[PDB]
Amino acid sequence: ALPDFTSDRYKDAYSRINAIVIEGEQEAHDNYIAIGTLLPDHVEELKRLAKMEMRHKKGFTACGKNLGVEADMDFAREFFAPLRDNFQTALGQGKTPTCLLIQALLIEAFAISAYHTYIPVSDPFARKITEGVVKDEYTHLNYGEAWLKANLESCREELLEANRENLPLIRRMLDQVAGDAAVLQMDKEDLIEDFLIAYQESLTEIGFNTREITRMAAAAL
Ligand SMILES: CCCCCCCCC[C@H]1C[C@@H]1C(=O)O
Ligand SMILES: [Fe+3]
Numbered sequence: 001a002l003p004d005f006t007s008d009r010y011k012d013a014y015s016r017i018n019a020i021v022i023e024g025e026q027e028a029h030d031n032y033i034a035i036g037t038l039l040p041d042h043v044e045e046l047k048r049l050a051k052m053e054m055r056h057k058k059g060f061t062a063c064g065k066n067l068g069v070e071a072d073m074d075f076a077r078e079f080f081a082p083l084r085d086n087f088q089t090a091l092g093q094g095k096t097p098t099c100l101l102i103q104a105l106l107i108e109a110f111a112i113s114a115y116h117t118y119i120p121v122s123d124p125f126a127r128k129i130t131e132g133v134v135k136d137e138y139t140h141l142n143y144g145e146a147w148l149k150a151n152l153e154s155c156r157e158e159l160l161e162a163n164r165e166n167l168p169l170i171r172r173m174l175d176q177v178a179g180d181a182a183v184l185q186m187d188k189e190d191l192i193e194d195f196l197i198a199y200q201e202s203l204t205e206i207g208f209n210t211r212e213i214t215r216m217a218a219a220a221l
């Protein structure tokens with residue numbers, strides 16, 4: 001069941017998946033620095049999170065180089081454009097809960113699911129890099145959960161709107177990546193399950209009840 005990492009079929013799918021991961025890590029760095037303009041007293045902690053994202057980007061860049069694959073960066077920029085646009089719109093409006101739901105919850109849960117699914121089918125070099133990134137994703141999810149949990153009473157409606165608008169974009173991103181992910185021997189059903197479990201667990205931690213969460217996860221449709 002392990003893929004042939006040297007085949008043209010594998011390298012072609014990897015060129016797009018690796019580019020999406022590299023672009024995602026760069027946008028994650030940018031997003032935590034941007035949140036620092038909304039939360040000036042959190043700047044040092046956000047800089048630390050942004051620095052971890054740069055370490056992840058460098059590591060995944062090395063994964064692509066190791067397989068002799070040239071990352072399709074243009075494809076990756078277009079892939080993130082819808083979610084990036086919604087983050088920039090919220091940032092410009094000073095909407096911190098929306099920025100945090102997009103980056104610290106949706107994007108981190110998407111990263112956790114993708115990385116957990118990739119690890120058992122990854123090449124030995126990439127496996128170590130991916131394993132060394134997963135602990136940091138939980139740190140980032142925890143940061144977002146902690147702020148939203150402390151501020152839930154003033155941003156309940158905003159979070160429901162942010163979820164309604166952005167959860168379907170994650171669903172569309174999963175649909176667009178499924179073909180290439182299957183070449184990498186990753187099952188779309190495992191990616192969906194792991195993402196929903198991480199996202200539902202974060203919403204539970206924040207303080208949403210079962211009914212609220214069910215209504216929220218249903219927005220994906
Ligand atoms: C098969 C799915 C692979 C594509 C999904 C990878 C998304 C990368 C998400 C990174 C930006 C998130 C982070 O570092 O917090
Ligand atoms: Fe990361």
Ligand SMILES: [Fe+3]
Pocket residue numbers: 028053108111136137140
């Ligand atoms: Fe992250």
